[PDB]
Design a protein around this ligand. Structure first.
Ligand code: GTP
Ligand code: MG
Ligand code: ZN
Ligand code: ZN
Lengths: 50, 230, 77, 352, 249, 87, 149, 79, 119, 189, 228
């Protein structure tokens, strides 16, 4: 969706944005996996386990 | 010149929305050449059908709320933008929807025209809470291409200006997602050949095979200018 | 400026006795802004013939503004 | 009514008409510069990157003012005296103010800088055009060491240029940047790994040898190629890029026992409060230097895993380091609080 | 909602009061876009009253920054609800958590200088999905004053106005509800008594030619500010005690 | 209109009277009802000149037809309203 | 914890991924940090920020154009902005901004007419603010008179 | 001329005088309708004046020469 | 250089300087050129250093002085001295909204100066 | 404000003799960089006084500046704004190069304003002191000036003068490095 | 479908080698779509002839130096990579070059075969300094396409590789350089349209215009798979 300039980080020393991006991706990864399991309709038991 | 044409090999329709298309054999480097050039056309140029105009009775503007309805009129409009419709004959059709009672209104409740296919009948449009509540609306579907917003459309036409006609951003383009993967294809002699696997994800209808044919057509049509005129 | 200069251009495009009583009344070329009855002090010395010649100058000038492209165009302002 | 024909007229009027752009605050004369305007649909002014330096203009919500020189005299004042192309050098020091920054430097650094062998080490190329062909074709990295043959143009005693063909050992990247380089400049100027400091000397040299027109076109070319390769490079900011010293906790525990020694010498009533203050501050100031030096040796020359023969050492390709070393962004004190230790902070008083 | 939160999001959203929260736990008897009726459980429900709480939701209203304040219902019809739960979300809240903007797929890399100093390169996809699109409710007023020359009129009858423009004004001279308007369209017709002004000799001559004597009634009509364009969602009329009311009022 | 140099010196009582085109002897600005300047007031049109171009107050003399005329009735010279920033 | 969560996502430990240029289809030389940043559209819009004016209303005493976009204001060309023109040596542009653009009432109308007639002739005079200054100084009881040539 | 003014500046010398000379010439083409020496190639009077100075066709002294030439021939015609 | 504008005359010249007057060094050197040619009593002087603020207030131009700072005091000093500013500096010309005596304006302003010299 | 280039040549012989700033071990401002594009005064030749090298009225071009370094010029009289004889302004010669142009300043340019802007801007925009011991880096003979030291009980040359300077003299006899040795400092040699 | 086709606007032939071609109008995004897809074919896929194999007598390896010759053997090989040759009939030809005396050896000194055209006869190959020096070599020219290096050939073909056969990087592709720049094109209504400026630099025989025509042809030849 967006392309941000990395040259606005080392000078700024706001590394929170990077951690937010990594974790945000991880959060969305789990979201994409649950999304994939719901599209397949595996079952209540398997969703519960994951 | 060692001219070598590919042939459409497999069309694996995993779903009506998602389809994989393998393609071989491709001469070395033509996998990415065609792969990308096609992907660009497939995302933009592809034509389709989408809701342009909405008219609900007892609704003057999109910002109001209708009683006996969970969704605000804007919420309902957003749902209609995502309504999958195929029109076979005409380029412009007006579908009518009258529904009542305690029911999640689905796409199936729309009176389907003879040559009009609702691709996702279970698609949610509105939630009627009060049983006495009845909703009646006329959804105008037009055929077009790309993204034509309601802001571009309220600054051009406007000869007839009916108060109580809600204009909607048209999302004509069917291609939701596209990726092409290039794997090596093996001939007895030529092991440098490649296969092009195009994973398409589209909204309702537009057929995977049909889309690819049209996309290659638009590319060849542009190439006419560089072949015919020098 | 454009408005006042515009009229002058088409004021010398009418008759010689049509712009010698129409301007000497409004005080455009003349020294003093006279009325229909006061234009008699110059040379006209008439009351009805002055009013016929004033409006005859105005009517030929209305068609000069309709052809150049004003009339209803310059009506709003 | 904004009729169709009115846009074509507007297009006619603004051609060859200079407009003044101004940014607050206007500290020196370059805070106002003239440009030829280019009409764009969309409500934001588009500014040339290379003059962002003069304006101190960063697009974090900055706004600018537009002024129309009306009279023929004012138009000529704008085109001759105030045009950006005519006003390159700082009036304060004899130095060019129009100097690539940020992405531009990073791209050119990336191109010029060398790697061990990589794709197509020790190849032989006919022209820099064959080099470009090789790179974009994917049978040579920009950092591949290569014996190419480039023909440089050196100025003689008169105005006539003397050209000379020779085989130098440069990277593919450097050969391609030579194409941007005007005829008249030496090849040895681009043959080094280019940073912001070298690129300004490039522009200065260009100005004193060739003059205004060539420098203006050259500066634009450098900007285009700089951005272009910066984007190709796919450079980014990871959490693994911030390398810390393997010997931080040791240095800190040591410095902490040391400070404890002077606190104990205070409790004994011999060393005054002021002497201890000064000696504690000196211990930590040295600890800070040592940790920073440790990070920077560990980071600068951390690429000690090469090939060809056996184990070889070369400059680290860490994105964060590259950014600092090129002078694109970051510094040695910015990396201190990014992987090493923050250090001592001084109060609103001024006191630490 | 923000994917990467802190936790304070819930407390801010609830404590700010912009979200409708449940006074008493029970089952939702009636959901609506405009209101929410919850029937209270017997254990919390006082023995006096019927024990049915009705929360009327505040709809599309103007903010001080001319932004849009709307309350959306976040419960389903006939759902069991605990006391102190979010019944309806305020303008920037999602299921009781604070939602100030929108998370999205970001890549950190230089791109042809279109992200030069913090400059941002955004995909058309975000514009298309209308997710960053925003609502601004603006308030335009038309004042009929009493002057030395006489009272100003709110009639649709204005010197020099096209039927195109008067199409959107009702008999009273007020634009219809739901009507889309753009810069220069008249919202409320207003006309003001003009006293004496020395007409330049050229205007004396010109009005003698055309004949259309400068109408005493001038033109003070409230029109759409230049370059703003939107939909009329509401009109309010304030009249004093005894002036003849507009047909629209 | 174009001068060479500019001088500052002490204002003589007599010099101050040279600039003045009338003595203000009343605090009155305008009339409450007819928002027109009050006699010998701070906004007196009889002193500082006409409110409207080539128009006396009481309206006896209008337009360039009466150029330098001083209305006997209201006591206002018929000239440009520009003078009210000058006198 | 974040890298462990990435692994449950089958995403890389670096949080950097291989990306492809939409235009060319070829890959970027190295991994790029990709993920989800929660972003905000600030109150500062370009519809409320863009402003333009050629000719409009003028201030009451000083006769220079008004301030503010809501009042259709001229941008202030301030002392600091003036000095920049002085450094450059651009005398006519400066005089222009002092006179025909600002107070000079005769100058602005005459200049407007010249612009519509194509002729970009400069016909300047005296800024109305200066006239006022003098009158204000004399109202203070200091005789300040102009000695003509 | 259009982009870079350096060669035009090197003909006259004084930037300030280059502006005065090109402005006076541009006023001639703007108002007099005096004919251009260089093909306009669809450029504004300002640009033409600077091109003319770059090639060394227009000059403060040359302008003053053609001023007296034409003014004196008109004085001759009057008498 | 602007700080070293003024100089204090210690000992009389052939003009009406006499002891302790502080005048611009430019004007006393131009006086000394006319003294060299005419002889008469030569002027002995000493150059004085001035801080930026006072140096700006020391310029003969009272329009420049008043526009800078201290405006109430500057105009009382100028009003009592009966001072006449002949307008040579940039500040003064910018205030009356005229052509700068520098850059583009130097051509026109010297043409005016010769019109002034010849009547 | 008022200072403008008024004249081409004031015809003055005046200027100020400048030297190279050798503050510390790295040459902070070279003579070449401090006298670049400054109208030289009198006749400034090479060390060996027996032949002229540079002309009287000549702009300092990068060429002549390069030659200055090969000839090792110690110090040079350069025409300055302060020593200009021009009344009511300064001559193009006393100023030198317009740094923004890269050539000799044009008469009429408003120099003062440029000067004040140039000095002021950096300040406006811009808005490890453990000097225990001096280490000399290149070999040389120790050359003190403005120094009055006295030998102590330990056997060490202790300095009893406030502004003591320490030079570093090379083989031929010219200043390479320079330091500030403070009061009560202990010298090694 | 409102299919918007571009039309060939300007063909600026600055030189027979270098040519710029502007193209408009192109619908939004098609500038890069065509631009790149063409550039790829133009570089790697355009067919031509190039030196594959070299044998100089008295030369065992490319790193040695021959006496009476200014250029090292590598320098000579680099010059042969840039040798412009057209072969009319056969796909593989071996040209012989024997030259002596104090002469800059040019392309014309090669014994031209009946159906073999040397496009640049003045092309420098070697500089003979000693008059007694004589050079004799056999240059094998093959027809191919794109860029085939000798490093990618030794690992694939491990058949006959006897000592003395000098392998040289094959440059069959005639397109010496290509870049496409995309600028915005203006229509009264459509300002989103773009113009495609393709700067070609090609060598002998193959003309810039001719090459572009053939490039679009090869693309359209593979566009028959999906019928239209
Ligand atoms: N006049 C003025 N300018 C300001 C103010 N606040 C910020 N700025 C400007 O906005 C910018 C914000 O800091 P940066 O510009 O990022 O600093 P920088 O020079 O880029 O240095 P780095 O951050 O190290 O790259 C500065 O250039 C300031 O000049 C203010 O209150 N007044
Ligand atoms: Mg900023
Ligand atoms: Zn009266
Ligand atoms: Zn001098």
């Amino acid at each position: 969706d967006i392309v941000l300039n990395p040259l606005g980080v080392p000078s700024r020393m706001n590394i929170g944005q990077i951690l937010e991006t990594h974790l945000g991706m991880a959060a969305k990864g789990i979201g994409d996996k649950i999304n994939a399991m719901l599209k397949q309709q595996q079952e209540v038991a398997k969703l519960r386990e994951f | 010149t060692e001219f070598l044409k590919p042939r459409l090999v497999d069309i694996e329709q995993v779903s009506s929305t998602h389809a994989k298309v393998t393609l071989e054999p491709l001469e070395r480097g033509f996998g990415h050449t065609l792969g990308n050039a096609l992907r660009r056309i497939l995302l933009s140029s592809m034509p389709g059908c989408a809701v342009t105009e909405v008219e609900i009775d007892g609704v003057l503007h999109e910002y109001s709320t209708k009683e006996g309805v969970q969704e605000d009129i804007l919420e309902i409009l957003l749902n209609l933008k995502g309504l999958a419709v195929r029109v076979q004959g005409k380029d412009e059709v007006i579908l009518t929807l009258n529904k009542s009672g305690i029911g999640p209104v689905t796409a199936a409740d729309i009176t389907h025209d003879g040559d009009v296919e609702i691709v996702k009948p279970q698609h949610v449009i509105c939630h009627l809470t009060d049983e006495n509540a009845s909703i009646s609306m006329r959804i105008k579907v037009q055929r077009g291409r790309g993204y034509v917003p309601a802001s571009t459309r309220i600054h051009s036409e406007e000869d007839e200006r009916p108060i109580g006609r809600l204009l909607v951003d048209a999302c004509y383009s069917p291609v939701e997602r596209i990726a092409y993967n290039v794997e090596a294809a093996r001939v007895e002699q030529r092991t440098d050949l490649d296969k092009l696997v195009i994973e398409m994800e589209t909204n309702g209808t537009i057929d995977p095979e049909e889309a690819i044919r049209r996309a290659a057509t638009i590319l060849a049509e542009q190439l006419e200018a560089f072949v015919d005129l020098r | 400026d454009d408005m006042k200069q515009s009229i002058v251009k088409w004021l010398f495009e009418l008759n010689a006795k049509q712009r010698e009583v129409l301007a000497r009344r409004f005080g455009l070329l003349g020294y003093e802004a006279a009325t229909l009855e006061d234009v008699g002090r110059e040379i006209g010395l008439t009351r009805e013939r002055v009013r016929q010649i004033q409006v005859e100058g105005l009517r030929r000038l209305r068609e000069i503004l309709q052809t150049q492209g004003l009339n209803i165009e310059a009506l709003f302002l | 009514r904004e009729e169709a024909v009115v846009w074509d007229i507007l297009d006619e009027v603004i051609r060859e008409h200079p407009v003044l752009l101004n940014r607050a605050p206007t500290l020196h004369r370059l805070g106002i510069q003239a440009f030829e305007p280019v009409l764009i649909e969309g409500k934001a002014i588009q500014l040339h990157p290379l003059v962002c330096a003069a304006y101190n203009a960063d697009f974090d919500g900055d706004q600018m003012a537009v002024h129309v020189p009306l009279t023929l005299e004012a138009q000529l004042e704008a085109r001759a005296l105030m045009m950006s192309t005519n006003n390159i050098l700082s009036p304060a020091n004899g130095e060019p103010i129009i100097v690539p920054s940020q992405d531009v430097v990073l791209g050119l650094y990336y191109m010029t800088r060398d790697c061990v062998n990589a794709k197509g080490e020790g190849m032989v190329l006919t022209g820099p055009k064959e080099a470009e062909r090789l790179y974009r074709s994917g049978l040579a990295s920009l950092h591949a060491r290569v014996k190419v043959r480039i023909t440089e143009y050196e100025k003689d005693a008169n105005g006539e240029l003397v050209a000379k063909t020779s085989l130098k050992d440069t990277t593919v990247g450097r050969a391609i940047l030579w194409m941007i380089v005007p005829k008249g400049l030496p090849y040895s100027i681009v043959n080094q790994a280019l940073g912001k400091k070298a690129i300004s000397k490039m522009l200065n040299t260009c100005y004193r040898i060739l003059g205004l027109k060539p420098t203006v076109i050259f500066a634009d070319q450098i900007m285009y190629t700089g951005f272009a390769y910066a984007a190709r490079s796919g450079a980014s900011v990871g959490i693994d890029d911030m390398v810390i010293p393997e010997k931080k906790h040791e240095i800190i525990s040591e410095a902490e026992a040391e400070v404890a020694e002077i606190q104990e010498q205070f409790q004994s009533g011999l060393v005054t409060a002021g002497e201890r203050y000064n000696k504690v501050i000196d211990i930590w100031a040295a600890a800070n230097d040592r940790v920073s030096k440790a990070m920077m040796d560990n980071l600068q020359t951390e690429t000690v895993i090469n090939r060809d023969g056996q184990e070889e050492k070369q400059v680290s390709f860490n994105s964060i380091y590259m950014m600092a070393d090129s002078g694109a962004r970051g510094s040695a004190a910015q990396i201190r609080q990014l992987a090493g230790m923050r250090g001592l902070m001084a109060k609103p008083d001024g006191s630490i | 909602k923000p994917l990467v939160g802190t936790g304070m999001e819930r407390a801010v959203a609830v404590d700010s009061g912009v979200t409708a929260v449940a006074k008493r736990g029970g089952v939702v008897q009636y959901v609506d876009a405009s209101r929410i009726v919850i029937k209270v459980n017997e254990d919390e429900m006082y023995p006096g009253e019927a024990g049915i709480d009705i929360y009327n939701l505040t709809k599309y209203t103007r903010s001080n920054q001319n932004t849009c304040i709307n309350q959306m219902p976040c419960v389903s019809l006939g759902e069991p609800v605990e006391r102190g739960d979010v019944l309806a979300d305020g303008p920037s809240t999602d299921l009781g958590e604070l939602a100030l903007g929108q998370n999205m797929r970001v890549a950190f890399m230089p791109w042809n200088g279109y992200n030069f100093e913090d400059s941002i390169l955004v995909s058309e996809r975000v514009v298309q999905e209308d997710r960053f699109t925003t609502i601004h409710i603006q308030e335009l007023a038309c004042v009929s004053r009493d002057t030395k020359l006489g009272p100003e009129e709110i009639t649709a009858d204005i010197p020099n106005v096209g039927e195109a423009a008067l199409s959107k004004l009702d008999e009273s001279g007020i634009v219809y509800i739901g009507a889309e308007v753009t810069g220069g369209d008249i919202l409320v017709g207003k006309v003001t008594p003009k006293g004496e002004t020395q007409l330049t000799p050229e205007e004396k001559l010109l009005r003698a030619i055309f004949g259309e004597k400068a109408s005493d009634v001038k033109d003070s009509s409230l029109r759409v500010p230049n370059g703003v364009s939107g939909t009329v969602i509401d009109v309010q009329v304030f009249t004093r005690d005894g002036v003849e009311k507009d047909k629209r009022a | 209109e174009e001068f060479d140099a500019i001088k500052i010196a002490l204002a003589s009582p007599d010099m101050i009277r040279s600039w003045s085109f009338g003595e203000v002897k009343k605090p009155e600005t305008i009339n409450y009802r007819t928002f027109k300047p009050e006699r010998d007031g701070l906004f007196c049109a009889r002193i500082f000149g006409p409110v409207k171009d080539y128009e006396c107050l009481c309206g006896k003399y209008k337009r360039l037809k009466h150029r330098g005329v001083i209305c006997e009735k209201c006591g206002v010279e018929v000239t440009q309203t520009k003078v009210r920033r000058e006198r | 914890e974040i890298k462990e969560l990435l692994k449950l996502g089958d995403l890389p430990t670096s949080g950097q991924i291989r990306l492809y240029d939409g235009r060319t289809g070829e890959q970027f030389e190295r991994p790029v940090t990709v993920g989800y940043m929660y972003m905000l559209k600030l109150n500062h819009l370009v519809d409320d920020k863009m402003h333009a004016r050629s000719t409009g209303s003028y201030s009451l005493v000083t006769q220079q154009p008004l301030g503010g976009k809501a009042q259709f204001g001229g941008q202030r060309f301030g002392e600091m902005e003036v000095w920049a023109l002085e450094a450059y040596g651009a005398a006519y542009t400066l005089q222009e901004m002092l006179t025909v653009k600002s107070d000079d009432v005769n100058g602005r109308t005459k200049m407007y007419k010249n612009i519509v007639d194509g002729n970009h002739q400069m016909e300047p005079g005296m800024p109305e603010s200066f006239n006022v200054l003098l009158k204000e100084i004399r109202s203070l009881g200091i005789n300040i008179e102009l000695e003509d040539e | 001329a259009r982009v870079t003014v350096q060669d035009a500046v090197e003909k006259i010398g004084n930037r300030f005088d280059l502006v005065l000379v090109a402005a006076r010439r541009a006023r001639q083409m703007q108002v007099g309708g005096k004919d251009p020496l260089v093909p306009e190639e669809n450029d504004k009077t300002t640009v033409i004046a600077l091109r003319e100075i770059e090639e060394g066709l227009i000059n403060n002294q040359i302008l003053d020469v053609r001023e007296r030439q034409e003014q004196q021939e008109q004085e001759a015609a009057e008498l | 250089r602007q700080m070293l504008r003024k100089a204090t005359i210690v000992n009389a010249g052939s003009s009406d300087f006499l002891e302790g007057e502080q005048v611009e060094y430019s004007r006393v050197k131009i006086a000394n050129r006319e003294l060299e040619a005419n002889g008469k009593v030569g002027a002995t002087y000493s150059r004085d250093l001035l801080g930026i603020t006072k140096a700006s207030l020391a310029t003969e131009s009272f329009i420049s002085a008043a526009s800078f700072q201290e405006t109430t005091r500057v105009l009382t000093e100028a009003a009592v001295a009966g001072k006449r500013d002949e307008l040579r500096g940039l500040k003064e010309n910018v205030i009356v909204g005229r052509l700068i005596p520098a850059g583009t304006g130097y051509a026109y302003h010297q043409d005016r100066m010769r019109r002034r010299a010849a009547g | 404000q008022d200072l403008v280039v008024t004249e081409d040549d004031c015809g003055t012989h005046e200027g100020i003799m400048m030297t190279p700033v050798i503050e510390g071990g790295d040459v902070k401002e070279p003579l070449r960089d401090r006298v670049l594009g400054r109208v030289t005064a009198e006749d400034v030749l090479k060390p060996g006084t027996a032949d002229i090298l540079v002309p009287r009225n000549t702009l300092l071009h990068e060429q002549w500046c390069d030659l200055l370094e090969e000839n090792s010029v110690d110090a040079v009289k350069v025409r300055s704004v302060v020593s200009c004889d021009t009344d009511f302004g300064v001559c193009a010669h006393c100023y030198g190069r317009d740094l923004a142009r890269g050539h000799i300043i044009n008469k009429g340019e408003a120099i003062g304003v440029i000067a004040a802007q140039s000095i002021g801007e950096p300040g406006t925009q811009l808005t490890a002191a453990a000097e225990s011991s001096i280490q000399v880096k290149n070999k040389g003979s120790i050359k003190l000036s403005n120094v009055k030291s006295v030998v102590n009980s330990s056997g060490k040359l202790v300095i009893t003068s406030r502004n003591t300077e320490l030079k570093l003299i090379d083989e031929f006899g010219r200043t390479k490095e320079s330091y500030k040795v403070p009061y009560g400092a202990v010298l090694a040699k």
